[PDB]
Amino acid sequence: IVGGKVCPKGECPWQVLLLVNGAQLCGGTLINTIWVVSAAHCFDKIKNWRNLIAVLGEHDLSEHDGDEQSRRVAQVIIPSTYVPGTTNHDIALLRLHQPVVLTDHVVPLCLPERTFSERTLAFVRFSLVSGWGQLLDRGATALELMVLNVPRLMTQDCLQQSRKVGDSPNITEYMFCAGYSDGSKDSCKGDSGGPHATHYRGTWYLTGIVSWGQGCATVGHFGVYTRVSQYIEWLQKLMRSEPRPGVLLRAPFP
Template sequence: MYTAVDHCLASPCKNGATCTRLLDTYVCKCLPGFHGQHCDRARRTSHGCHYKNGECEHFCRHLPDRSHVCFCAPGYRLHQDAISCMAEGEAACGRTVTRFTPRVINGKICPKGQCPWQALLTEHNVFSCGAIVLSDRWVLTAAHCVWRKPATVFNVTVGEHDLNEDERTEQKRRVVKVLIHHDYNKSSSDSDLAMLKLHRPVKLGLYVVPICLPARNSSFGRALSSVRHSTVSGWGRLSRFGPAAGILQRLMLPRVPLQECRLHTKLNITTNMLCAGLKAGGQDACEGDSGGPLVTRYKKTWFLTGVVSWGKGCANKNLYGVYVRVSNFLSWIENIMSNF
């Protein structure tokens, strides 16, 4: 005669959970605040996502029972530890593939492969602006770079590093669609964003990697803003009347509160903008960098926080650089990428 073992007699369920006996096994029904097979893992409910981003490597979302879960950017899967994000393929967004030991970067060359989301926008084959790789078919730039011009005059180059050398990593594509944000205001520079669709996909890899976008409807904005410094890159002019840099530059800058930015620039800074730079001047994105990325590293992954919009002159004292605040435009960006 067969007798089923009652596993519940051994009290396998912890933290006040209820044990339900099944044929040859059991399930634990956890009390709120606990999870895991034996309800032995506490959900970090006390502060949820607001404390250390819920310890999540990427994004954190609150659940109705006041607990929270971690989730990852597209192209990553959540590790069994329920916190870490594992890249699923080559060229997962926001991760540089080339091995490089970072040094302090103040207006120095961006080593090849370390700014792989940087793209170059040319108009009639002349360098006009920076742009940002979002996928193999879409790049983002500033609206004023493409305002009232047909798509046919533009090309985008990715995998570019030294403008004066053919490095055999460059991929050039025609632009077939220009979508300027519907609220773009030329005089105030508000909502200064445009999406560009390429005529055929670029090949992602060592030197071409999309940047990650922050998640909508998560507390990740708060986590990103806790990282004080962001990095801007581009081939813009190195000084006010100087030549454009031949080699891609990058620069680490502290972000500046809007009130302080308004105070020191005496300019109309809207909530769709963010400021970065040093009050003493001397280091900032310069002309020709419009449309380029301002990126922020959270743990091991880089996320897009701003798009270079404008600044009064190059690195003038008390004049911060102004960027489009990308977090306000995530729905618009994602809608275009999925529907056009």
């Protein structure tokens, strides 16, 4: 996170840290006691599928305070439409080996209904983005969880504003822009997979996933987030189904 602040301990209780062989991989979002939503691109280089761990209740990476709960990731479900090495359909659904125990420090973020998300949540201006990612473009990652408030943009406004820069990729219907074009504030590498959480009438909901952008907090550019509303039905169907052998699962989308 670039230009944000430390998330006071327990204020982003759905934030997940994904580890591979004990090393920081990506963020994620807890949506109930056994399911985590993250970004498909985080799993492009995994060979060590058996050593993928999700940590809930994490805050400061340098100290164990007893609120952390670790779970092995039993399955990583990616949409059939996701192509490795690309940015489109950038979502993954992770099943934990055993549920996390809900506490003041471990709470799920509400996965909203599609219509409510499209007709109400999509019009809430500001949302929170969080992670232990790079504090600066080409900089060190954070030891304490960071958070940033970002305004959402209509894709046309993002496209006209996000300068005619060669090979500037397409912002699809499975994405949205959020952030600032003045080079001050953005999510960054290491934050991928993390939540873009929206407040509505006293409750927080999952509306985006840290996915990509042209650098971090680059002038004329915005952060690009997976548009979670497109995947509600896909996620709901998978969560109502029985586990299958093998860690990686490709599931048809739609």
